[PDB]
Amino acid sequence: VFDDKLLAVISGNSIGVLATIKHDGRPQLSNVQYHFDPRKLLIQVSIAEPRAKTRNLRRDPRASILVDADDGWSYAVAEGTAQLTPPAAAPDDDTVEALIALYRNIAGEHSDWDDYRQAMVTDRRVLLTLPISHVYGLPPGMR
Amino acid sequence: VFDDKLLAVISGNSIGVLATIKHDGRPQLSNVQYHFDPRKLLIQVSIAEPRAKTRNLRRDPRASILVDADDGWSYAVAEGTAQLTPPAAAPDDDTVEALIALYRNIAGEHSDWDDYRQAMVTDRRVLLTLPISHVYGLPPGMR
Numbered sequence: 641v642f643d644d645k646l647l648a649v650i651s652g653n654s655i656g657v658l659a660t661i662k663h664d665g666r667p668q669l670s671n672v673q674y675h676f677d678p679r680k681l682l683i684q685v686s687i688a689e690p691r692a693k694t695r696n697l698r699r700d701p702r703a704s705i706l707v708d709a710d711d712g713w714s715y716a717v718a719e720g721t722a723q724l725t726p727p728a729a730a731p732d733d734d735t736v737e738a739l740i741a742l743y744r745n746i747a748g749e750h751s752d753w754d755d756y757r758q759a760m761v762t763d764r765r766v767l768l769t770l771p772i773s774h775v776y777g778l779p780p781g782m783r
Numbered sequence: 784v785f786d787d788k789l790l791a792v793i794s795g796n797s798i799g800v801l802a803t804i805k806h807d808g809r810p811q812l813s814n815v816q817y818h819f820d821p822r823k824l825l826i827q828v829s830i831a832e833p834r835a836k837t838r839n840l841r842r843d844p845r846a847s848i849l850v851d852a853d854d855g856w857s858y859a860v861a862e863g864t865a866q867l868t869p870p871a872a873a874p875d876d877d878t879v880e881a882l883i884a885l886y887r888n889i890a891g892e893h894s895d896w897d898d899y900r901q902a903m904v905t906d907r908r909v910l911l912t913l914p915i916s917h918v919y920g921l922p923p924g925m926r
């Protein structure tokens with residue numbers, strides 16, 4: 641039941657710190673917006689192919705994400721192995737579809753889906769699906 | 784030469800996400816308090832002596848700390864090779880004396896130093912010094 645406390649932190653937020661592994665083995669850090677699927681215990685995020693974090697995950701898919709509790713001090717960290725889609729290549733391909741689904745979960749119903757599809761392709765957007773294999777941290781009550 | 788806008792972020796905060804390298808190569812994350820010396824350009828944090836997977840810090844001290852800005856997405860990341868003191872073993876050893884100065888830098892004059900001293904020994908506290916090698920991130924704008 642202790643993991644339920646760590647999952648709750650992840651569920652109560654939409655932004656976290658994604659840590660990837662550089663070519664030299666050193667950690668690389670950045671923040672990302674995300675959607676947490678409690679059903680499959682997945683964390684879904686959108687990223688760009690040319691970005692460092694993306695090139696890192698292509699060589700080494702291991703990833704972790706730290707998320708702060710609402711007190712801004714307590715936290716939970718999800719660790720797992722990323723599953724990336726190829727980059728959007730056409731406004732109607734499967735990657736763009738999964739990204740349309742994510743956007744709905746993050747921001748809601750987009751206004752100009754056609755413009756969105758165009759943008760996903762222009763930015764070579766990739767959907768990062770990170771199944772949670774292990775969670776650690778210091779959830780509220782422990783800090 | 785680092786981006787002054789990125790250093791301002793670090794100097795305007797006191798907590799961030801520390802990332803060290805575990806044995807398997809995965810980063811180990813946590814929310815920590817830090818002190819930033821803007822002249823010597825270094826960051827100092829207090830940590831229990833690492834055990835198990837986290838112990839790898841002793842042979843591969845490369846670390847990074849991400850610090851959040853006050854706006855929506857801005858953040859800075861300080862990268863460097865950490866130097867570690869030996870773990871605190873005596874309420875009055877060099878390490879504890881060093882952690883007292885760290886506490887003063889971060890919080891100020893402590894109520895009861897004798898409690899602090901024994902607490903440092905009890906947690907096998909180590910003073911980690913991260914001289915800044917590289918600084919990256921997303922700089923905040925005029926606000």
Ligand SMILES: Cc1cc2nc3c(=O)[nH]c(=O)nc-3n(C[C@H](O)[C@H](O)[C@H](O)COP(=O)(O)O)c2cc1C
Pocket residue numbers: 669670671672673674685686687691692693694856921
């Ligand atoms: C207006 C705005 C919207 C953003 N939206 C997202 C987003 O939807 N998802 C995400 O993961 N990051 C988002 N970001 C931030 C980037 O992910 C972040 O700056 C990035 O991690 C750079 O990574 P890199 O250093 O690995 O290239 C946004 C930033 C801004 C300024």
